[PDB]
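Appendix B. Extra example for self-study. Work through it before the problem class; the solution is given directly after the inputs so you can check yourself.
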Amino acid sequence: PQITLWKRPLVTIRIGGQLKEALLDTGADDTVLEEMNLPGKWKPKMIGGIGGFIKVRQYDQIPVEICGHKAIGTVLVGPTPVNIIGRNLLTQIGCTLNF
Amino acid sequence: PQITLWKRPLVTIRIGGQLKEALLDTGADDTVLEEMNLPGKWKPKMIGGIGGFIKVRQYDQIPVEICGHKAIGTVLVGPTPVNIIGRNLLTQIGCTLNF
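Solution. Structure tokens for the complete assembly:
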């Protein structure tokens, strides 16, 4: 599909057997999801942006479907205010910016 | 252009007569640049990101050229980790996401 940018580019994803709303974010290196109790091994990580850093849990090899397009990779879980799909998964679904 | 996302979508912009590098950021409502001088009046504002809230200077109706495409709009200046072009200007240059 083609997503315009008049509003926040929010789409539906499926992760860990849940459907969620998430923001397609070309400015994010990584995918960061709001607090959820995913099974699996994880390691601590700190990620930054405007305002500073937050502590997150890094889970690897997690299947994530984005508007019906399958992806699998690293997901970060922590106290982000919005679910963010970053470049690590956007590349896997063949997402481009176009103008 | 069509810009893929295997690398950060960094582009050259011209603003206040000076060249800068900025990230095309679909996850940002607003355009936020690192500390620099811009001509004209500004208003104090606060914005939020993944780490919390910061204080910025809001400059209205600022011309910005982004990869040769012209925008004129709001530019916030403050302690962002990287220069970001947000949706307020991405829409002006006709940018969409496609997959």
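Self-check: The domain at 1-99 of chain B is CATH 2.40.70.10 (Cathepsin D, subunit A; domain 1). If your reasoning did not lead you there, revisit section 3.
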